[PDB]
Design a protein around this ligand. Structure first.
Ligand SMILES: Nc1ncnc2c1ncn2[C@@H]1O[C@H](COP(=O)(O)OP(=O)(O)OP(=O)(O)O)[C@@H](O)[C@H]1O
Ligand SMILES: Nc1ncnc2c1ncn2[C@@H]1O[C@H](COP(=O)(O)OP(=O)(O)O)[C@@H](O)[C@H]1O
Lengths: 480, 73, 110, 12, 500, 179, 217, 72
């Protein structure tokens, strides 16, 4: 173009372009600056177009760092709203939100670019052939089955789960999965994503000697970004998935960390965009672009996008509006209550709120359904009797309630799982489980056959036969 | 005061622009304006004290609180 | 009252604001009838009450009925007084709106 | 909230 | 073929007659991801739509002094901000006719299934006032819902406005669609709108409708989270206009508002973006105006205006099991009844969850059928008795018969309240059920087998006594020979089932 | 009511109290090109300038501008009453309030052809038929983006519109698509 | 004293210093990191730091976010704690270990700043006022405090002996809390509870006592 | 702009002077043992520590691949 822009008011991470009054670009268009740096001027920072303030001044947030910029410094416009190079070229490389590789290898071809802002897909093109995929983690497999191609909702406080869960999930289902994947790293810790990249190298799923063998692509919006990048790395992961849905026509499992980082970056910038504060303090336009990000992820008769969202509820305050919206967005929800792992019941998924819409008996094999409803009733009985057991003593209540408390205590301790990366917290080796295996295990528990064993025997168990081995080990070590 | 002040009614600004550096101040008179919740923004009155009682055409009384730039709030 | 015809300046939903000539400005709590320009062709008029002066010959009222289908800058007439509602002993058994006009299709009251 | 939900729990 | 298309082109370009009328116009000051401000428009009314330069349609909300704010009904990319935009003059009508039945649409009522264009001749204002008190009447017609307790404890009548305020993700959409499928029998055209759900959920729901045959007579206006704010802001208004129009064509109707919490959330979003000054809990002051104008639009007609019935059954879900949240306390302050579908009550296994505690009905029992009083007054008493004296169950072992037998009957009635997902159980399925429950013809049975006992009961008697079906459907009143045949079938079926 | 329009109505008030409405309009027309040449407008805006230098060069301007003494008083009062950051907008905004209180009204003709005196007079007569001004001034511009002829934007500064131009072909496409 | 460095900043010294001095600590961190020696850093009184930022930010009319703090405080503390890490040997194992302390609001960790900084950091460690109040010096709210690094940043001997003792202490605290209102506890449960209280005694340190790794092994 | 020295003596009308550099505190050896307050001022009567690096107070984080796995 020919609109040599001028910078007017640098307000933290939010800035602005003075334009020639004739020609101005439109929303979400790229705006690359002619920035300087500590030496020379080989500095290039992009800017995204949100809104235009009437008389030749616009509102635009920079993605990269907002330091060292002067007023009246020139910017360059594109007209192409951030066409990001996603094809077969992206495989196995950590990319930036600018479509830039950071893994200090060569830049791949940018033939397969696509703009990051676009239309959500239509309603009618929507593949609904409802079937479950299995993992091998009992407390979600038995309770809240994961719909293939839907979305998975992982809610938890900071430090209750959500990381070894997603590591075990990629570790199982990526090698179980013939299609490629995407991990977006939206505002997690840089160390943990680094360690994921190391784990990926060790697993051989990348085979870092070869790009075309690597079944995953990486994008890391780390914490060093100004929030303009932190609100777009999510949609960069989106368009990385979207090219694999449309242009590649293969099924892709999708791994995202905390979207609460993304929407709180929106909350960070909406104050300085020239917009106003909202309900409790977030951005006003919460659910609009939230549901944009959501409904741009679905399965539409050309490829399957199963997806896992690790949204962090702050401090277990479930009244929060963005996870409230995401609750209705999702398909299979698991809240990860902190009071469980406080008692060390790893992993700490609540058996009470957690569910899926896949609990149809006519899809889950009705004996499974009977089992699940029975055990949820049992845990409900335990949690409601929690008020009076710390008041009336253990043996005020009736004897049916006594064995109920005992068996429920045993099953909630049986909810553990020694994951194959939990060893840096247990040291015991990781353990893989089945599905019908667990079905038989939970029926044999709650039917009350081994309802005499020590409560520690059923702890950190693979399954109930492993629990019987630990039971005989425990009744050896107890006498001696 | 930042976006809109109440010292720019058309009548007081015409009374201002009929002469630049001119005669005495309206020290006990002026135009009442912008009557909020008992909040009177009168122009003029550059001898009124802090906490001064002022009397009105309704017979109601008022009390000076915030003697501002040009008005008295 | 008189022909104090002012422009409806600013409309934000049921909050509507009406300008005035600088000669006469209405009092506070003063009922103002808007000759309500309706979609139905007839002047379906609406009323309002000003509990906020603006000082700049501009009033701040809300309307009792729906302000939809109302444009910017219609004329207005003040009552010069608060809501003169025709109440009395003759108003027995009748259903009323807020301003007291009878609404149960039994015709008008005194 | 976090208290108030927990205070609802305590009340119940 | 193509030449006929060319002659259609010819007849349309002869239909162009150079109409010279006045159009209000103005220039784009600023657009703001939903908000757009333009200046130079006076004669636009309140709540009026305009048309921009690019083709994107937008509606005007605040007529400010200097400029005028217009909010967007689509994707705001191609806005140029210095380009000119024009006005229309219409009050955002939607075209309407019969052919929507089984169709799905956007907020503009324009088709999205691709099942052709709905042949809509008539139209309607969106912001229609509610019918007046003189057009309003009382309620006589019972609404059916298929569920035991809510056929029973808080009944719903054709005409009134019952509300369900179940919490997060526990079965509101389920029981709503169960009312829909329970209306397979009658002529009532339910109105389904779904707001702020994922498209996959609503597609799953309408395929459930395709299986059950609801698509012959249902209507879905689903406005998912993809759409901009104004579309979901005015979509239940469009559904309401559909309801009221077809009610004016003398048909019986109900409506399922999905997540008026999402409606209100979208409203405070777009309004606060539009610099409407915020009020309570950051929602602007007229959120109650919105919900009242939406809900109290539904009423019961005048029987000289056609005697159509309109029944509002909306849904608001509340953050983490609250009553004192803002829009729930508003909608309970506005509407007649309420229903608490609580999470732990679901997770306890009651299928589905009904708090029969604070669940009260203003209409109470006045909309139930005549047989329903006889079968249900004793039920209300027994439920009050179990809900009060329930905690003695931990030593009802030790207690006397007058509480003990009564507690056993109460808990097996709570087991009777269990009903599976989407089993359409109309009036004759349940009057016998509540009848043997309140007569104690099953209290010898233990505390699990009663469900299979009851399904074998109702299947056998529904095949065995079509005259009982007829005298239910005709009298709506328990005559003594009906109850005689009932107890006869009870003894026979109990004998067979006891012998297994 | 803009903040600027307050003082625009003030200038209307002094043009009311005298009969130099055309002279003060020529004076503000001189003032808009005085407060053109952006170093000049910047210097008088420029909120750190010593105000006595502002008023002395202002008196130099008043000596050289040839203003009426009331519109000469206007710049001094816009200096002292500190609203100097919108003064070019004030000089623009005097136009329509002068146009209204004068009694005329303004519009714009956008044709393909330079419309002559008789045609523009007939168009102004139709405008006074639809608006009723006194000496309605409709300046024009002749833009070839149209096709057929005259378009009118009248009433307010850009409010309402009639036309016989490229609209007759673009809306012909619109009323041919017919969807 | 030869290997410690203090960068002191009291309160009455103005707010600019109170904002920028932790980044001066970050500058010393970055230098000594790129000189490849191991170096730790103990950021302290971050509530004071966020408070002075709230002062200087709100005094420049940036419209503040939730609970009148500005929104970029997450961006602030991220920009702080993303600096300290361990470099690889390619750049030469320049390590930086960071331990911030944050004053929770009077025993309540559900306030504004600690949520944000817990999301920032890897590992939290709680000081229970209850356990220090009962005299468990120093007080570790066991079970509720983890390390995201896990035992991979422990020596091999520690995993080789006792790599579940966090889990096992959590188990014991659970069972003891349940067993307090019990009556007839088994000898198995008795040995579990008693050996757990033995470990409770093992979590007792005389203060300022230097200990070796083998001395804890 | 925000003051670092509660500027009583900072007076209106005084022109301000530009520098064109970000905050860069000088850092070298002989820091080991000393106490400054964000300005390279040894505030214990120490003297002066000379320094030559003067790295930026605000700097980018290190490279992600070059971050080490934490074993020690
Ligand atoms: N009568 C029933 N028997 C068994 N399961 C049921 C019954 N009713 C509902 N469910 C189950 O409960 C789950 C949650 O129900 P549902 O999705 O209707 O909750 P909801 O809150 O209405 O959803 P939304 O949050 O979209 O409104 C469903 O997956 C359904 O399978
Ligand atoms: N199943 C488990 N086994 C062992 N440790 C666990 C398990 N789940 C959680 N943890 C501990 O709790 C922490 C939770 O993971 P974390 O990295 O905090 O993710 P998030 O911050 O998203 O919760 C882990 O660091 C780990 O120490």
């Amino acid at each position: 173009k020919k609109n040599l822009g001028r910078i007017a008011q640098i307000i933290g991470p939010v800035l602005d372009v003075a334009f020639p009054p004739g020609k101005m670009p439109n929303i979400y268009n790229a705006l690359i600056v002619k920035g300087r740096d500590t030496a020379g001027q080989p500095m290039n920072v992009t800017c995204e177009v949100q809104q235009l303030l009437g008389n030749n001044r616009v509102r635009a947030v920079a993605m990269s760092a907002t330091d060292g910029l002067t007023r009246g410094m020139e910017v360059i416009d594109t007209g192409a709203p951030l066409s990001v190079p996603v094809g077969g070229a992206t495989l196995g490389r950590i990319f930036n939100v600018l479509g830039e590789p950071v893994d200090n290898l060569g830049p791949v071809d940018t033939r397969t670019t696509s703009p990051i802002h676009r239309s959500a897909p239509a309603f009618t093109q929507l593949d609904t052939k409802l079937s479950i995929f299995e993992t091998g983690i009992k407390v979600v497999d038995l309770l809240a089955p994961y719909r293939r191609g839907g979305k998975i909702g992982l809610f938890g406080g900071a430090g209750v789960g959500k990381t070894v869960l997603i590591m075990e999930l990629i570790n199982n289902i990526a090698k179980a999965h013939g299609g490629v994947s995407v991990f977006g790293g939206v505002g997690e810790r840089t160390r943990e994503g680094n360690d994921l990249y190391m784990e990926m190298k060790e697993s051989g799923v990348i085979n870092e000697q070869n790009i075309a063998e690597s079944k995953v692509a990486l994008v890391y919006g780390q914490m060093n970004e100004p929030p303009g990048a932190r609100m777009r790395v999510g949609l960069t992961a989106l368009t990385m998935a979207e090219y694999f849905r449309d242009v590649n026509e293969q099924d892709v499992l999708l791994f995202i960390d905390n979207i609460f980082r993304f929407v709180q970056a929106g909350s960070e910038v909406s104050a300085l965009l020239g917009r106003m504060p909202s309900a409790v303090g977030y951005q006003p336009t919460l659910s609009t672009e939230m549901g944009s990000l959501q409904e741009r992820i679905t399965s539409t008769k050309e490829g399957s996008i199963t997806s896992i969202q690790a949204v962090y509820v702050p401090a277990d305050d479930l009244t929060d509006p963005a996870p409230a919206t995401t609750f209705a967005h999702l398909d299979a929800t698991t809240v990860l209550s902190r009071g469980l792992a406080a008692k060390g019941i790893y992993p700490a998924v609540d058996p009470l709120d957690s569910t899926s819409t896949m609990l149809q008996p006519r899809i889950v094999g009705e004996e499974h359904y009977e089992i699940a409803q029975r055990v949820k009733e049992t845990l409900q009985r335990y949690k409601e009797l929690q008020d009076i057991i710390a008041i009336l003593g253990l043996d005020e209540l009736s004897e049916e309630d006594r064995l109920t408390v005992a068996r429920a205590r045993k099953i909630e301790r049986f909810l553990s799982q020694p994951f194959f990366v939990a060893e840096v917290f247990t040291g015991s080796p990781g353990k893989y489980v089945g599905l019908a295996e667990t079905i038989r295990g939970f029926q044999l528990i709650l039917s009350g056959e081994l309802d005499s064993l020590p409560e520690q025997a059923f702890y950190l168990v693979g399954n109930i036969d492993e629990a019987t081995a630990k039971a005989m080990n425990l009744e050896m070590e107890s006498k001696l | 005061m930042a976006t809109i002040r109440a010292d720019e009614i058309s009548k007081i600004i015409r009374e201002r622009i009929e002469g630049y550096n001119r005669e005495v101040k309206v020290v006990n008179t002026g135009t009442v304006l912008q009557v909020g919740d008992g909040i009177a923004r009168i122009h003029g009155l550059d001898e009124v004290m802090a906490g001064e009682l002022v009397e009105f055409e309704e017979g109601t009384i008022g009390i000076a609180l915030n003697l501002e730039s040009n008005n008295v709030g | 009252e008189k022909k104090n015809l002012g422009r409806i300046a600013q409309i934000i939903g049921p909050v509507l604001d009406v300008a005035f000539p600088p000669g006469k400005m209405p009092n506070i709590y003063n009922a103002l009838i808007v000759k309500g320009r309706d979609t139905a062709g007839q002047p379906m008029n609406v009323t309002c009450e000003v509990q906020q002066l603006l000082g700049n010959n501009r009033v701040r009222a809300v309307a009792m009925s729906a302000t939809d289908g109302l444009t910017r800058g219609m004329e207005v007439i003040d009552t010069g007084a608060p809501l003169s509602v025709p109440v009395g002993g003759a108003t027995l058994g009748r259903i009323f709106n807020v301003l007291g006009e009878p609404v149960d299709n039994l015709g008008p009251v005194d | 909230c976090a208290n108030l939900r927990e205070l609802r729990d305590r009340i119940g | 073929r193509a030449d006929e298309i060319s002659k259609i082109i010819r007849e349309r370009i002869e239909g162009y007659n150079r109409e010279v009328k006045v159009v209000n116009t103005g220039t784009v000051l600023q657009v703001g991801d939903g908000i757009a401000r333009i200046h130079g428009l006076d004669e636009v009314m309140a709540g009026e739509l305009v048309e921009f330069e690019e083709g994107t349609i937008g509606i005007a909300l605040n007529l400010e002094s200097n400029n005028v704010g217009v909010v967007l009904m689509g994707d705001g990319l191609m806005i140029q901000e210095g380009s000119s935009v024009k006005a229309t003059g219409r009050i955002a009508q939607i075209p309407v006719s019969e052919a929507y039945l089984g169709r799905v649409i956007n907020a503009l009522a324009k088709p999205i299934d691709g099942r052709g264009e709905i042949t809509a001749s008539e139209s309607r204002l969106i912001e229609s006032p509610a019918p007046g008190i003189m057009s309003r009447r009382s309620v006589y017609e019972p609404l059916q819902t298929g569920l035991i307790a809510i056929d029973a404890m808080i009944p719903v009548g054709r005409g009134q406005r019952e509300l369900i305020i179940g919490d997060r993700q526990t079965g509101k959409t389920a029981v709503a669609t169960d009312t829909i499928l329970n209306q397979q029998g009658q002529n009532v055209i339910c109105v389904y709108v779904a707001i702020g759900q994922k498209a996959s959920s609503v597609a799953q729901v309408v395929t459930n409708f395709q299986e059950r045959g609801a698509m012959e007579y249902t209507i879905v206006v689903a406005e998912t989270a993809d759409s901009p704010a104004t579309l979901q802001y005015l979509a239940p208004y469009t559904g309401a206009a559909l309801a009221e129009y077809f009610m004016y064509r003398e048909r019986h109707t109900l409506i399922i508002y999905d997540d008026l919490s999402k409606q209100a959330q979208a409203y405070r979003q777009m309004s606060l973006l539009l610099r409407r000054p915020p009020g309570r809990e950051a929602y602007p002051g007229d959120v109650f105006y919105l919900h009242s104008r939406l809900l109290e639009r539904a009423a019961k007609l005048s029987s000289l205006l056609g005697e159509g019935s309109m029944t509002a059954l909306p849904i608001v879900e509340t953050q983490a099991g609250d009553v004192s949240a803002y829009i729930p306390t508003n909608v309970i302050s506005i509407t007649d009844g309420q229903i608490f579908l609580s999470a732990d009550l679901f997770n306890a296994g009651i299928r589905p969850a009904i708090n029969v505690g604070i669940s009260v009905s203003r209409v109470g029992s006045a909309a139930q059928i005549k047989a329903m009083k006889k079968v249900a007054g004793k039920l209300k008493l027994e439920l009050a008795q179990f809900a009060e004296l329930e905690a003695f169950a931990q030593f009802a072992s030790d207690l006397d018969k007058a509480t003990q037998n009564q507690l056993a009957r109460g808990q097996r009635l709570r087991e009777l309240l269990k009903q599976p997902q989407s089993a359409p159980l109309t009036v004759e399925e349940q009057v016998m059920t509540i009848y043997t429950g309140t007569n104690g013809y099953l209290d010898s049975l233990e505390l699990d087998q009663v469900r299979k006992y009851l399904v074998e009961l109702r299947t056998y008697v529904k095949t065995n006594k079509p005259e009982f079906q007829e005298i239910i459907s005709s009298t709506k009143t328990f005559t003594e020979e009906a109850e005689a045949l009932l107890k006869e079938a009870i003894q026979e079926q109990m004998e067979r089932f006891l012998l297994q | 009511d803009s903040t600027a329009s307050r003082y625009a109505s003030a200038l209307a008030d002094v043009a009311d109290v005298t009969g130099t409405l055309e002279a003060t309009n020529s004076d503000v027309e001189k003032l808009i090109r005085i407060f053109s040449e952006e170093p000049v407008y910047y210097f008088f805006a420029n909120p750190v300038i010593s105000i006595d230098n502002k008023r002395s060069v202002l008196d130099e301007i008043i000596t050289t501008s040839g203003l009426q003494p009331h519109t000469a008083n206007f710049i001094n009062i816009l200096i002292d009453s500190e609203r100097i950051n919108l003064v070019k907008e004030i000089l623009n905004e005097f136009e329509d309030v002068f146009n209204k209180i004068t009694g005329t009204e303004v519009a714009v003709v956008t044709s393909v052809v330079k419309l002559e005196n008789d045609h523009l007079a007939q168009i102004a007569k139709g405008v006074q038929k639809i608006t009723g001004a006194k000496n309605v001034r409709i300046k024009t511009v002749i833009d070839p983006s149209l096709v057929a002829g005259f378009t009118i934007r009248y009433g307010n500064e850009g409010s309402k519109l009639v036309d016989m131009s490229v609209k007759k072909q673009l809306e012909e496409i619109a009323a041919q698509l017919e969807m």
